[PDB]
Amino acid sequence: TALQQAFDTCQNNKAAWLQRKNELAAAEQEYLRLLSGEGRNVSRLDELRNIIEVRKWQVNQAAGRYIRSHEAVQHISIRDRLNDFMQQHGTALAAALAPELMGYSELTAIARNCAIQRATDALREALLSWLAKGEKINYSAQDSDILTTIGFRPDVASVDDSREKFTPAQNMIFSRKSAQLASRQSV
Amino acid sequence: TALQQAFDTCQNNKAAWLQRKNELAAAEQEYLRLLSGEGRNVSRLDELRNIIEVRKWQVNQAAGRYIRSHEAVQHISIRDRLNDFMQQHGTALAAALAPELMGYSELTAIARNCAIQRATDALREALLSWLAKGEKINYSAQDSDILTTIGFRPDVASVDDSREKFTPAQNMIFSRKSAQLASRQSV
């Protein structure tokens, strides 16, 4: 259920990001149509500029949160699949790299780290050979639906929106802007 | 079939290392008994000191090349075992890491490197989870005899004398002195 929990977390994050970008687009089109009009309304255009700026900041933050949630759900799926599969095949995987496993319990910390790094490097060449052979494969059978729905990669729109970042001072300034807009808009 | 070559290389390296060790022991014991003896030939003492130092250098080099051969044969055995293991159960391994392996062909250098790094982190966490329970195992069935006869790690006597490092000029002058010793003892 934990994988399902992360899946629905990412789904509602995606929904929030989508509605945020829809609101941003509506604000932008309203601003441009008002600018096309003959009315001056300097205060109106200034407040619309502030609104669109804070809304695009919110869209960027939502995209970043969606990226983090997607990474989290992929990571938890990876860890659970690896745990269950290795439990099903503990002996085979252990004997594959056996000569560097005995004595691990009492091994010194530096030697322990060096041994596990050597094991990872040994698996690196197996992964390289597997990708060189380039066999076609899909997600795990047990959670194929969740992994297909979550997508192999996040949407490119979130990638380009999250490409640019902001300094923490601007982050907190925009957080205050969001708080005040929510406060004065609820009335 | 390079495993057999590595095995016999390790065997003859061990034989040469034992020969160097026993000849060094003989040289040092005869030097000690001549020191305790009534003889006062200072030239004999100086030449015995030269023999002792050159034999110590030869033993150090033999230990170094034995360590290199042992690590080489261990790497070859690990590579072969992992290769046949992935040829046996590699599809399930690829499925377990599917969320970061799809479309590897068209990925750029940075994307491929990051995906490989994430896969290494995943397998590292799986390995540490497996090692947490401390499930004891043995050597690989196909090549158990070679691993047993080469040992899990080289003995202390092969590393305790190899903890001293020589500058390249020292190595060159010791090589020249060893060549002179061989030339003078051949006649």
Author numbering:
A (entry chain e), B (entry chain f): 4 to 190
Question: What did the original publication write about this model?
Answer:
Phage satellite P4 polarity suppression protein, Psu, a building block of the viral capsid, inhibits hexameric transcription termination factor, ρ, by presently unknown mechanisms. The ρ hexamer adopts an NTPase-inactive, washer-like, open-ring conformation until NTPs (preferentially ATP) are engaged and RNA is bound at the SBS, leading to ring closure and RNA entrapment inside the ring.
In complex II, two hexameric ρ rings are bridged by five Psu dimers that connect ρ(A) subunit 6 with ρ(B) subunit 2, ρ(A) subunit 5 with ρ(B) subunit 3, etc. The different rotational orientations of the Psu-bridged ρ rings in complexes I, II, and III lead to different spacings between the innermost ρ subunits, which directly interact in complex I but are separated by a gap of ~ 30 Å and ~50 Å in complexes II and III, respectively. Psu helix α7 (residues 170–186) is placed in a cleft between the two neighboring ρ CTDs, covering the corresponding nucleotide-binding pocket. ATP or ATPγS are bound similarly between all neighboring ρ CTDs in the ρ-ATP/ATPγS-Psu or ρP167L-ATPγS-Psu assemblies.
